[PDB]
């Protein structure tokens, strides 16, 4: 389902080379280019004490891959 969505998006985009392409690449498990970020594909949801820890502590955010704004 996620594969179908990202494939359709990559295709009507014109089949360019980018994160749309790289996610499909990693999905077919034959290559990877990890970017220095954390996208929608993997975001654990933090606890309340995690909120009190961050409130603005960026190191815990990058430690536990939480929701960032």
């Amino acid at each position: 389902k996620d594969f179908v969505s990202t494939y359709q998006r990559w295709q009507n985009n014109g089949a360019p080379l980018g994160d749309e392409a790289y996610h499909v690449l990693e999905t077919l498990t034959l290559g990877r280019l990890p970017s220095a970020a954390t996208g929608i594909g993997n975001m654990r949801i933090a606890t309340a004490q995690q909120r009190i820890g961050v409130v603005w502590n960026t190191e815990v955010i990058i430690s536990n891959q939480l929701v960032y704004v």
Binding site: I45, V54, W56, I61, V67, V69
Partner: peptide
């Protein structure tokens, strides 16, 4: 309220499952 929900989503904030529950409850 709507403005409350905007308040819970300002820059620098991190939401919790209650925010999402309220969002889906708005239907």
């Amino acid at each position: 309220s709507a403005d409350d929900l905007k308040s819970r989503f300002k820059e620098g904030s991190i939401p919790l499952q209650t925010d999402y529950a309220d969002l889906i409850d708005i239907a």
